[PDB]
Design an enzyme around this catalytic site. Structure first.
Site, PDB file in Angstrom:
ATOM      1  N   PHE A  32       0.830  -1.204   0.000  1.00 31.20           N
ATOM      2  CA  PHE A  32       0.000   0.000   0.000  1.00 31.20           C
ATOM      3  C   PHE A  32       0.865   1.255   0.000  1.00 31.20           C
ATOM      4  O   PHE A  32       1.912   1.289   0.644  1.00 31.20           O
ATOM      5  CB  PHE A  32      -0.908  -0.016   1.238  1.00 31.20           C
ATOM      6  N   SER A  98       4.819  -5.488   2.365  1.00 28.62           N
ATOM      7  CA  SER A  98       3.804  -4.807   3.172  1.00 28.62           C
ATOM      8  C   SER A  98       2.498  -5.599   3.179  1.00 28.62           C
ATOM      9  O   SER A  98       2.421  -6.673   3.772  1.00 28.62           O
ATOM     10  CB  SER A  98       3.585  -3.370   2.669  1.00 28.62           C
ATOM     11  N   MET A  99       1.476  -5.067   2.513  1.00 27.15           N
ATOM     12  CA  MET A  99       0.207  -5.769   2.362  1.00 27.15           C
ATOM     13  C   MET A  99       0.395  -7.084   1.617  1.00 27.15           C
ATOM     14  O   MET A  99      -0.296  -8.063   1.889  1.00 27.15           O
ATOM     15  CB  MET A  99      -0.796  -4.905   1.598  1.00 27.15           C
ATOM     16  N   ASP A 228      12.092   0.327  10.400  1.00 28.64           N
ATOM     17  CA  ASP A 228      10.730   0.286   9.877  1.00 28.64           C
ATOM     18  C   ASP A 228       9.768   1.011  10.814  1.00 28.64           C
ATOM     19  O   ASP A 228       9.501   0.547  11.920  1.00 28.64           O
ATOM     20  CB  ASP A 228      10.306  -1.174   9.680  1.00 28.64           C
ATOM     21  N   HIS A 257      10.529   1.403   5.959  1.00 28.03           N
ATOM     22  CA  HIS A 257       9.439   0.490   5.579  1.00 28.03           C
ATOM     23  C   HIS A 257       9.488   0.293   4.094  1.00 28.03           C
ATOM     24  O   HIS A 257       9.149  -0.783   3.590  1.00 28.03           O
ATOM     25  CB  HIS A 257       8.045   0.969   6.030  1.00 28.03           C
TER      26      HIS A 257
END
EC number: 1.11.1.-
Lengths: 440, 440, 440, 440
Positions: A32, A98-99, A228, A257
């Site tokens: 995302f 991530s997602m 992160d 991140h």
């Protein structure tokens, strides 16, 4: 390029995707609020390393359709299943960010590692982000995530600015590991997404993947940056590693991140290493299985040892001459024609440089099996089944149901090039052929 | 229902049979001159005790064909073999009465105890009825039996009246243990038989079963009435017990030959007890199979031990709370939804006192099968097949041909009560569902 | 998603569009120089309010085709007509902004209010922008508009910045009602448009809609910001209100031209209020039809009156309770089980707070359909069709082709949670089962 | 003759049935514990009156299969449904006795009166036998019926003796209205049933039919003997009559429960009367529809009146000579060939005594459909649809989709006997044929 994964009202739900390069399929699932193009630094490296790179945009993100439904990991994983099945990917590696890690975990759990060879988790959400009573290792409580959703709904465009500040750790990395223009592009990609999808996505972040983790059987890699901010290393990767101790664990010091761009060099190195190592690991276990099965039909003696040696040499990658090998096989004193035939099939299949040898008669005459129409009938019926098959264990079981005579002819079909099956399946056939002969 | 056991001229020889209830198969072989319906008091009890009751009429008796050939125990046993093989009964218990005991002894001796779990002999002929020099323990000489045959040939209808007079010991039991109407029906059944079979049957009574007896290896039960006029206790059961000392011996005091009706209470009690030992033995082997299969999908840990314990408890009959179990299942953090669904299905199925608990939401949502219309279609196709099925092993095999997604939805069909399958079949499905999941 | 509205040379002219949510169709026609995505703040609110939001990009704007012809309101209205007919919208509400207001006026005038329930005009051009002799209420003369066109042709990209300066009244609203990033996105959307369309569009602004206005027969709403710099309130909305006095008039104090974003809260409030009047009106006709169909199955008597009352109560929102109703239904003596099932289905569907009540058994057993696999097969076939459907009429029509037995089972699938259909479709099914039962 | 209605284990469930005579179908559903042969007094009378008599034995009764499952009125009605559909009965009359009345009520309620013309209830159970708080008009409480079941289980054969004592009111009627031998036969039939079915049936008697009653739309008959001991008149028929006031009510004074035999004369009279009235009633409403449609194509004049009169006469049963009618048609002026063809079709179809007249040349050439192969193709496609159809209203709608030319040829197919459709369907076609012509 698009793949239809559903339908919303009068419109259809299509996902934008990209298919580049030739080799083992590597699926890159973005995070995302970006798109498949985020992998470009990884994608560039993977293409150089002779891989087949497949990227796609999640629904409501990038160039994909922007529906107002199906924003849950069961739907996200269902979409991935459609993607993998539409392209008919085999022995593929899933890489999530991530997602994207959520999609990998959920798919593996719900649909099985049939088409999957290995998995990689970069900047993972796993195992559970939500901070509750039963899960104290959560990063933040429900109220927090409700704030994010409300923040996006307030003004998603203004949100993106603040989002990418911690996504990349700009105070540290801006002007050093990431340029002003690079960030600018990321913002554009964010804005290009769906308004609904933007605020619907954060609700998916506190998904409970704890039940999905045990279902991961393929080789795994867990990578995460210590710096992160979005997903704190300790609430994510560190506890994830306890849940999956078998996984290869990589901690990139000072990475934010968004390390896919900033620390791309460290990421590529770690990923390409894991991929090459896991590939050779499954190559060796496959070839040693083929060796034992092929040697099972050869009678013990000095000839068996010689065969074992030349088999090890080609499996090791020592580019042996094929014309010489085939002339050596043809001239053997105690070896049965079928044995020579099977061996002829195995050598052409494993030797990378065919050098220019026309399909030898002695191998063809060995596999035909008297040219019985009864044998060639079962051979095509089996050939139809093997075209659908991909797993070595899967290809071997269904082949065992056929007689030794039918199997030999089936191998002959493939050798003559009247058939097109994958190497893993082809090995399944030969091992099944060897097994039947051994019991006769 | 009929089973073809031979052919006589232009016509075929078919035996009328009945297959009722679900569980371990109990075959009831009637005596002279009645039919399978004679067991009706036993069948009623056996059906209550959850057995599968199978009865058939001997050739020339009841609703079976009336040929003029094959009236010998070698043919009688051949017919029984055909019956057992046609129905493909496995681990079944054979129960014989009067003439029926001869079939049991001969089949076991001639065809082996492969399909048989145990055997029962009620009002047995064994070991040898004929009174000769080598066999002084015989009831009567050759000349006597020749008299019976000639008596039947004179007038079988008038014979039946006198026959049932000693068959039931009417002077004692009429108006007490057997009614006038009951006897009337027995007479009708006798007259309904074949004229040829009627006079051919008595010659089979003096068959030498002495060589057949040692070949009995399965657990055996020998029951007999002391007041037996037709087959005197000392010339039959008592000497039979010396030949088979391993057998469970039961002597019903004052019971006549047709004790199946008159002393039905004493007979049922003794029979169900002997049967219960073999039934509980096969129930456990079914539940241990389900346990291993269900535990196969649960990930290793302390939770796996907890589930196995709670499974053993419900299987043992330890009335556990279901409302508590389901809430415990619902709240597990590492259990997959499908796993929770399967266990929930199993618990509702195995727990007796369901206590009127409404179909849980969490189980329904697990079993729905992502509401794929393609998955729901395959599930119905499988449900049609499972509706016809009866055996656990049979239900498991045909279910394995379907995908894991299709199986889960099929379980959902049954759970939601949109489907009606027997418990043995239901377990076949769940075990098949677990097998697919274990293989991914 | 695209809808073909014409053809220019070798290429076709397609308009990008979006169809979200279920309910009464609300078509949102954007203004210059943006796209359908501009409505995102309204669209988000409208989706929450249970509407079906339909947006599309005008030719040469956003993701739509960029032809060099057809930049006149006769062509613009023809395009809208194609859109409405392609989607087959009925009883829909048209909402226009800036240029979008012109399309509403022209379409209604030229094609009639057949499919339209009501209309809304936000920041209207109407009745006539051009300042002439016969029209002194014009905002500016011809020369002015010639200046804008020439300005766009000079440099459209540089034009956009200055345009949005007065579009949002940035000196006031920037940093308060609109963020830098939000404007940034609007600019991108502007640049994304066609170069020709950009300079061709201003010529359409001085269109004479004075003849079109009287043709508005559906309920109308006129909204406008007083601080509108682009379209001065007195030369636009105020005189428009004199031309259409029946219309609901709303003046947003201090709101600029692009009030859709800046004063979104005031706009949504005003719009949803006006929409609620038109929405609730056809909502009642939907429930009144369902009532009549459901009551058709109930046998006449005092019970029928009681049900009708309780239905009216739930439709009004008074009753709210469900467990008592279900218990009341369960205990009725004249109701056929299927009738109880249908009513139970309707009540769970219409009662807002389903609470924590598990799906009732008496409803499940009524809808189960006896567990006929043939009824279950046709039910799944119907279920796939209903998943694609959106309209109540569309769902009812296709369901009528199926037998009453198949329909009941289909309702059972949804009730049991093996199915996921929208409420409008769900009502279509219920009416279709009711029609069949009444006709049986 | 048998009809398969289910499957129990290895065996299938078949019902014994009998199909006698020609005319409108009258289905006779027997009571406990007899069989279809019980109707013999009615069957003989109904056959004399030119009806088609259909009788079948309930599961576990008479010659039907004797399963140990499905002893409930939902299953009983499901079986009846199979019977009616297997035989494809249309415009049939259902007549039930004792238990049989329950089947009629449930089928009508559950499956609709599509195939049903009228219903008759003799010695009915309806509306509710169980005596409870909500139903004080019940005959006896729960404990009572439990006693009956236990009595059957005690001794099935001895139970029957006492049962038939009150079934026929032997103290009164024996030697007067029923012979010793007749009762003897009834007992034999009772014994012939299933042991399980015998004790399973009484539990079905306290079925709540109160919900089934309102769904009765066809003309109804309620007959009951005042001297009914088994089902007391006041707890059954009298309260049933209040529930169904439209029904024709007949009270036979002093008749017992088994009045089918004892008071057969009174029963037949009442039944044949009700049938004849319901038969002529359905003829008139159907034939008047046929009349208006046929007359629609005939041009106004004295000829139109003449045709209508001769049509009314044949419909009334005034069997006029057909050779004369056909000759009157053939030599008639002003009549078009197609009109003569249609009328010729109608007259052969409606005239009973066909006398033996060949398919006339003038009728065949009218119906040929000019010899167009396209017309002959559409005619067969329609013929396939009409073979499936059963209702008159249903047959006309699907036929209307075809052209007048295709319809004429379809009628020709049937007339020439290359087709076999039911009279109700046949009338649908001709009316549809007339409708298309009428619109020209």
């Amino acid at each position: 390029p698009f793949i239809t994964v559903g339908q919303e009202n009068s419109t259809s739900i299509d996902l934008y995707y990209e298919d580049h390069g030739t080799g083992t399929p590597v699926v890159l699932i973005h995070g995302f609020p970006l798109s498949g193009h985020s992998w470009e630094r990884q994608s560039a490296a993977l293409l150089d390393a002779g891989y087949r790179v497949i990227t796609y945009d999640r629904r409501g993100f990038g160039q994909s359709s922007q529906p107002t439904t199906g924003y849950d990991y069961d739907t996200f994983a269902a979409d991935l299943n459609t993607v993998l099945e539409t392209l008919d990917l085999q022995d593929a590696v899933l890489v999530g960010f991530s997602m994207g890690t959520g999609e990998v975990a959920r798919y593996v759990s719900s649909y099985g590692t049939a088409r999957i060879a290995a998995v990689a988790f970069l900047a993972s959400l796993e195992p559970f982000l939500l901070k509750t009573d039963d899960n104290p290792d959560g990063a933040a409580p429900q109220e927090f995530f409700d704030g994010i959703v409300a923040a996006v709904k307030a003004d998603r465009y203004a949100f993106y600015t603040g989002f990418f500040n911690d996504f990349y750790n700009l105070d540290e990395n801006l002007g050093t590991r990431i340029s002003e223009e690079a960030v600018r592009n990321s913002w554009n990609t964010a804005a290009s997404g769906g308004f609904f999808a933007a605020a619907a996505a954060p609700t998916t972040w506190y998904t409970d993947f704890r039940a999905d983790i045990p279902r991961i059987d393929v080789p795994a890699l867990i990578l995460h940056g210590t710096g992160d901010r979005t997903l704190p290393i300790e609430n994510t990767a560190r506890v994830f590693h306890k849940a999956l101790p078998s996984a290869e664990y990589v901690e990139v010091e000072g990475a934010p991140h968004g390390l896919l761009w900033t620390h791309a060099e460290e990421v590529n190195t770690a990923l390409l290493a894991f991929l090459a190592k896991a590939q050779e690991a499954q190559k060796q276990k496959l070839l040693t299985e083929v060796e034992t099965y092929v040697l099972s039909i050869i009678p013990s003696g000095p000839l068996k040892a010689e065969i074992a040696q030349r088999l090890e040499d080609v499996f090791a990658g020592k580019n042996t001459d094929l014309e010489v090998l085939m002339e050596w096989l043809k001239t053997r004193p105690i070896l049965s024609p079928l044995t020579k035939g099977i061996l002829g099939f195995v050598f052409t299949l494993t030797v990378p440089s065919e050098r220019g040898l026309q399909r030898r008669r002695f191998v063809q005459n060995a596999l035909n099996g008297n040219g019985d129409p009864n044998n060639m009938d079962k051979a095509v019926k089996l050939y139809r089944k093997l075209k659908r098959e991909i797993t070595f264990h899967g290809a071997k079981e269904i082949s065992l149901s056929y007689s030794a005579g039918a199997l030999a002819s089936c191998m002959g079909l493939i050798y003559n090039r009247m058939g097109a099956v994958t190497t893993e399946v082809a090995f399944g056939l030969v091992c099944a052929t060897c097994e039947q002969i051994a019991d006769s």
